Design a protein around this ligand. Structure first.
Ligand SMILES: O=C1c2ccccc2C(=O)N1CCOC(=S)Nc1ccc(Cl)cc1
Lengths: 551, 401
C-alpha cells in the first residue's frame, strides 16, 4: 500500500537544480520489461505519468526482470540527512525475553510517501524502440529504491508509526532494522501471538503489510553475524577449514573470523596468524604457517570445538569485568554478572606507544572496556585485575600522566603485573658516575657513542648507520654494560631520559629492549640530565672525545 | 518578538558532531529535562531532514542533586565566530581583574526568553542517545537562544544592558562583564557590602527572569620558578640547579648560569659555594619573582594553557600565546587525578576569562579516551574550553616545581 503518514520535506542542495541526464536507448525486451513493471507499479500508486513539463529526467534500466533506476545525479544533487548509520546494539546488552518474533515489511520504501514538492525531480523516461518517439514519462510518488533519503525517511516514518503502539504497550520491545522488525516480550506463546496480531493490524492501519503467523519466523535469529535466541546469544556458526596450503586471503578471512568469535569465545589468539601477514604480498601468495601459528590454530580450533553462548544483561546486577595477561602485549577479558556466566568476551593487543610497560597496557585495556561498557550497558563495571593495589599506586602517583580506574580490586591470576625495575630517586654513593654522550654526522649517517668516568675510565665505540638519537641510547646502553650492579648515568638527551624515565618493560626498538634487559640486571640505577653545550665537567669531557672527528 | 537574523560564516556549514555515549542515569536525566523544555516550547522534535548534530551532556548543578543539561557548541561557535566576535562582540574591561572581589552569576536562564531566528534553529540540532542503541534516539532543535552558544549573549546584549542599566548608574564603580551564560560582577567594597550589592543586583535580574561565586582576582599572584636554598650543594644539586636555570634562561632575559658552571666529577661529591656563586642565583632569584620582560597579551592570538601533574594533589600550569612567552603561571591543590585536573581546568579557565575575556586551549596530560570518559563526571561550569592531549616532557614537570 502507501502509508497515510505525513511526508518529510526534502530539498536539493543550496546552489543546485534537479537532475537532467538523458536516457540511453535500451534493447527491445528491456523496453518491454519496463513497460510491464511500470504499469503494475502505476496501478499501485508507486509512480505516475507526467506531462512534458518536468524538465527533469534520470536514466532508467532493467536487469534479469526488475527495474533499476540510477539516481547518482539526484543523489549528488539532493541533500544530507541525519545519519542512519549510528550504532548497532550489541547482543550482550539485550535484556532476556520470553517470546521473540520477527516481522519484515514488504516493499518498505514503496510503502512510504515521498514529499510532493520533490516528486518532480524523480521523473524518468521509458525509451521507445530506439528513440524517435516521445516516451512514457514517470515520476515517483514514494521512496525510490536507490535514492539517498529513503533509508532515513523510512526509519523516521516507521518510528512515528511505531510510537503510539509502543506507548500503549510499554512492556513490549521493538527494534527496527531495515525491512525488518524484531519484537520481544515476557509473555507466553499464546498471548504474545495475540499481541503480535495486535501489532500487524496496527501496522496495516498505516500501510505496512507483514507476513502472517503461517509464514512468520522463529528463533534463533541470524543478525549481523550473531545468532539470537530469546534467552541467549552467540556468534554465527563458523567452520575453520582444514587445509595444507594457506593463501594470504585464506589467513585473512581466518584472522577475521577469529576476531569475531573472540566476542564470546574466551582464549582466542591471532598474534601468530597476524605475523604471517606482516609484509607486502599478493592475496594469492601461499604462506607456510610458522610453528607458533600451527599451534595457535590448534587450540583456537579447540576452544571453538564446542558451541559457547553469552547470557543477556540483568539491569539489577553489577557488571564484573575481569582481565588476564595472555602473552606479551596481549590482553583478554570477560564480563559477567554471575560468576562465570559471560555476557561477552574480548581481547586487547592495541598499544600505540613506541615504548610501554604492563601497567599502562593494563590501564589502557581497562579504559577500552570501560568505554565499551558504557555504550553497551550504560553503567560502568567493577574490575578484577591481576595487579596489586600497591604496585598500582606506586605507578599512579609517580607517573606524570593523569589516570583513573573505576572501582577495581586485586585478583591473583598469574602472570601478575609489576614494574620490572625502578630508577633511583636520588644519586648513589660510591657508584661509578658515567657521563655518556652521543654524536653523529648528519651527512654520512655515521657516528660514535661513549662515556667517561669519575674513576678515570673511558670508551668510544663507533657505530655505523644511526641517527643523532641512537648515538644517545647506544651510549647510555654502553655505560650499562661496563658498569657495576650499581651506577649513575648523566645524559644531555631528554629523548633517552624520557624513554627511560617512564620504566618501559618493552619496546619496538632493538636497542631499547637491550637497555631494559640490562636495567633489570642491575640493583640501583640513577639517571640524570644536564644541558648540553655548557661547562659541565663530564658532559663537556665526553663531548670533546665523542665529537672529536666525525662531528 | 524581534528575531536577530543569525547568519553562519561565508562557505562554512552547520556542525555534524557525533553524540558521545552517555550513561543510563544521564540519559534518564536528559529525557526528563527535554520533555519539560519542549513542553514549554523551548525546543522541538525534528525530522531526518536535519543532518546537523551537537553533543549534549548531563551535569549536576553546583555539586548538588539537580541535573543540568549541557550542550557542546564548541563546533557551532567556531563556525559562527565572525557573528559573535566581530559582529556583536562583547568588549572586555581591564578593570575587572583589579577588583577585590568578583562574583560569578549564572544568568543563562534568561536566553530562553528570546526566540531564535527560525532560519538558524536547524544548526542547533542535538541528539539524546539510548543504551546499546536499542532505540533510535531523540532529536531536538532549539526555538530560542541556547545556553552554551556564544551567539546568545551577543544577541542578548540589548536586553542585558537595559536590565543592568539602573543598577550600573546607582553603582558606577561596580564592574560587570558578560561571558557565556555568566555575569562577572566585581567591586572594591568590603565583603558584606559587596555581597549586599550582589543580592541587590539579583533582584534586578529577577524582574526579567531569575553570592554565586566568591572571587578575588587582585590577590592572584605569580608562581615564581623557585631555586632551592639547600645549605651544602652537591654535583647533582648544582647540576640540576643549572638545569632549570638554563630552562629559565630561555625565558626571563638576563638569567645567568655561568659562574655556577665552572664549579670528570663524582655525582655524590659535595662542593663549596663560590663567592661568584651566591652572586648568581641571588640575582637570578631577584628576577623570576619579577614579571617577564617583553611579553604581552596579543588580543588577536588566542591563549594556550599547559598543566603538569606534580603529584600529591599538586598541579602547575602556565598560560601563553607563543611557547615560553607566558602571560601567567600558577598552581592548584574522594579525589582522583581526573577529578582534580577537571577542577584545575575550570579554575584556570575562570581566571583566564576574568583577565583576557577568553578561554585558553588546554594541553591536558592525560589519555583522550580517559578524559572523554570521565571529564563530565566532575565538570560543573557552563562552558567548555578547547583542549588537546599531550605528554609532559620529563624535565618540564621539574622546572615548574
Ligand atoms: O535491540 C534489539 C535488537 C537487536 C538485534 C536483534 C533483535 C533486537 C531486539 O529485539 N531488540 C529490542 C530489545 O530486545 C531485547 S531487550 N531483548 C531481546 C531481543 C531480541 C532477542 Cl532475539 C532476545 C532478547
Amino acid at each position: 500500500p502507501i502509508s497515510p503518514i505525513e511526508t518529510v520535506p526534502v530539498k536539493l542542495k543550496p546552489g543546485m537544480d534537479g537532475p537532467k541526464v538523458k536516457q540511453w536507448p535500451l534493447t527491445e525486451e528491456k523496453i518491454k520489461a519496463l513497460v510491464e513493471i511500470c504499469t503494475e507499479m502505476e496501478k499501485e500508486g508507486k509512480i505516475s505519468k507526467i506531462g512534458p513539463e518536468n524538465p527533469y529526467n534520470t536514466p532508467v534500466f532493467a536487469i534479469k526482470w526488475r527495474k533499476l533506476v540510477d539516481f547518482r545525479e539526484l543523489n549528488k544533487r539532493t541533500q544530507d540527512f541525519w545519519e542512519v548509520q549510528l550504532g548497532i546494539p550489541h547482543p550482550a546488552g539485550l535484556k532476556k525475553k520470553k517470546s521473540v518474533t520477527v516481522l519484515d515489511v514488504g516493499d518498505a520504501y514503496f510503502s512510504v510517501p515521498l514529499d510532493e514538492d520533490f516528486r518532480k525531480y524523480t521523473a524518468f523516461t521509458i525509451p521507445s524502440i530506439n528513440n524517435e518517439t516521445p516516451g512514457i514519462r514517470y515520476q515517483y510518488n514514494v521512496l525510490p529504491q536507490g535514492w539517498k533519503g529513503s533509508p532515513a525517511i523510512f526509519q523516521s516514518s516507521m518510528t512515528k508509526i511505531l510510537e503510539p503502539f509502543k506507548k500503549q504497550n510499554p512492556d513490549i520491545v521493538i527494534y527496527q532494522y531495515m525491512d525488518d522488525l524484531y519484537v520481544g516480550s515476557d509473555l507466553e506463546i499464546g498471548q504474545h501471538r495475540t499481541k503480535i496480531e495486535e501489532l500487524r493490524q496496527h501496522l496495516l492501519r498505516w500501510g505496512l503489510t507483514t507476513p502472517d503467523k503461517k509464514h512468520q519466523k522463529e528463533p534463533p535469529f541470524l543478525w549481523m553475524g550473531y545468532e539470537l535466541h530469546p534467552d541467549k546469544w552467540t556468534v554465527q556458526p563458523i567452520v575453520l577449514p582444514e587445509k595444507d596450503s594457506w593463501t594470504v586471503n585464506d589467513i585473512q578471512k581466518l584472522v577475521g573470523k577469529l576476531n569475531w568469535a573472540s566476542q564470546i569465545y574466551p582464549g582466542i589468539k591471532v598474534r601468530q596468524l597476524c605475523k604471517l601477514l606482516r609484509g607486502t604480498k599478493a592475496l594469492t601468495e601461499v604462506i607456510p604457517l610458522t610453528e607458533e601459528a600451527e599451534l595457535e590454530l590448534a587450540e583456537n580450533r579447540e576452544i571453538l570445538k564446542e558451541p559457547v553462548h553469552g547470557v543477556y544483561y540483568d539491569p539489577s546486577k553489577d557488571l564484573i569485568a575481569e582481565i588476564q595477561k595472555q602473552g606479551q602485549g596481549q590482553w583478554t577479558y570477560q564480563i559477567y554478572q554471575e560468576p562465570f556466566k559471560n555476557l561477552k568476551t574480548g581481547k586487547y593487543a592495541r598499544m600505540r606507544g613506541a615504548h610501554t610497560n604492563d601497567v599502562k597496557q593494563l590501564t589502557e585495556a581497562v579504559q577500552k572496556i570501560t568505554t565499551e561498557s558504557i555504550v553497551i550497558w550504560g553503567k560502568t563495571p567493577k574490575f578484577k585485575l591481576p595487579i596489586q593495589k600497591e604496585t598500582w599506586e606506586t605507578w599512579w602517583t609517580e607517573y606524570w600522566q593523569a589516570t583513573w580506574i573505576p572501582e577495581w580490586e586485586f585478583v591473583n591470576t598469574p602472570p601478575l603485573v609489576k614494574l620490572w625495575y625502578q630508577l633511583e630517586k636520588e644519586p648513589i654513593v660510591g657508584a661509578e658516575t658515567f657521563y655518556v654522550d652521543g654524536a653523529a654526522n648528519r651527512e654520512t649517517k655515521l657516528g660514535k657513542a661513549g662515556y667517561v668516568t669519575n674513576k678515570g675510565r673511558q670508551k668510544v665505540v663507533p657505530l655505523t648507520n644511526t641517527t643523532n638519537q641512537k648515538t644517545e641510547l647506544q651510549a647510555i646502553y654502553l655505560a650499562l654494560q661496563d658498569s657495576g650492579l650499581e651506577v649513575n648515568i648523566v645524559t644531555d638527551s631528554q629523548y633517552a631520559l624520557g624513554i627511560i624515565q617512564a620504566q618501559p618493560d618493552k619496546s619496538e626498538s632493538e636497542l631499547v629492549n637491550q637497555i631494559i634487559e640490562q636495567l633489570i640486571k642491575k640493583e640501583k640505577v640513577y639517571l640524570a640530565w644536564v644541558p648540553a653545550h655548557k661547562g659541565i665537567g663530564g658532559n663537556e669531557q665526553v663531548d670533546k672525545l665523542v665529537s672529536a672527528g666525525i662531528r | 518578538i524581534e528575531t536577530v537574523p543569525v547568519k553562519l560564516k561565508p562557505g562554512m556549514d552547520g556542525p555534524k558532531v557525533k553524540q558521545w555515549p552517555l550513561t543510563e542515569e544521564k540519559i534518564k536525566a536528559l529525557v526528563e529535562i527535554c520533555t519539560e523544555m519542549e513542553k514549554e516550547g523551548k525546543i522541538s522534535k525534528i525530522g531526518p531532514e536535519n543532518p546537523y548534530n551537537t553533543p549534549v551532556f548531563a551535569i549536576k548543578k553546583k555539586d548538588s542533586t539537580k541535573w543540568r543539561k549541557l550542550v557542546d557548541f564548541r563546533e557551532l561557535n567556531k563556525r559562527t565566530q565572525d557573528f559573535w566576535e566581530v559582529q556583536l562582540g562583547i568588549p572586555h574591561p581591564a578593570g575587572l581583574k583589579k577588583k577585590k572581589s568578583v562574583t560569578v552569576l549564572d544568568v543563562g536562564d534568561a536566553y530562553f526568553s528570546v526566540p531564535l531566528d527560525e532560519d538558524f534553529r536547524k544548526y542547533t540540532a542535538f541528539t539524546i542517545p539510548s543504551i546499546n542503541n536499542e532505540t533510535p534516539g531523540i532529536r531536538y532543535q532549539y526555538n530560542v537562544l541556547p545556553q552554551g552558544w556564544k551567539g546568545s549573549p551577543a544577541i542578548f546584549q540589548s536586553s542585558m544592558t537595559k536590565i543592568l542599566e539602573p543598577f550600573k548608574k546607582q553603582n558606577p564603580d561596580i564592574v560587570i562583564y558578560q561571558y557565556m551564560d555568566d555575569l562577572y560582577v566585581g567591586s572594591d567594597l568590603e565583603i558584606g557590602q559587596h555581597r549586599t550589592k550582589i543580592e541587590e543586583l539579583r533582584q534586578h535580574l529577577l524582574r526579567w527572569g531569575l553570592m554565586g561565586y566568591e572571587l578575588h582576582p587582585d590577590k592572584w599572584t605569580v608562581q615564581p620558578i623557585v631555586l632551592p636554598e639547600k645549605d651544602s650543594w652537591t654535583v647533582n644539586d648544582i647540576q640540576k640547579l643549572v638545569g632549570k636555570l638554563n630552562w629559565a634562561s630561555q625565558i626571563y632575559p638576563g638569567i645567568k648560569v655561568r659562574q655556577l658552571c665552572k664549579l670528570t666529577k663524582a655525582l655524590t661529591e659535595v662542593i663549596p659555594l663560590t663567592e661568584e656563586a651566591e652572586l648568581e642565583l641571588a640575582e637570578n632569584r631577584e628576577i623570576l619573582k619579577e614579571p617577564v620582560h617583553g611579553v604581552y597579551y596579543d588580543p588577536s592570538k588566542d591563549l594556550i594553557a599547559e598543566i603538569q601533574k606534580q603529584g600529591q594533589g599538586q598541579w602547575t600550569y602556565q598560560i601563553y600565546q607563543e611557547p615560553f612567552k607566558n602571560l601567567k603561571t600558577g598552581k592548584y591543590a574522594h579525589t582522583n587525578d581526573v577529578k582534580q585536573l577537571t577542577e584545575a581546568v575550570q579554575k584556570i579557565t575562570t581566571e583566564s576569562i576574568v583577565i583576557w575575556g577568553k578561554t585558553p586551549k588546554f594541553k591536558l596530560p592525560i589519555q583522550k579516551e580517559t578524559w572523554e570518559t570521565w571529564w563530565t563526571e566532575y565538570w560543573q561550569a557552563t562552558w567548555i574550553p578547547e583542549w588537546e592531549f599531550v605528554n609532559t616532557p620529563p624535565l618540564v614537570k621539574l622546572w615548574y616545581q
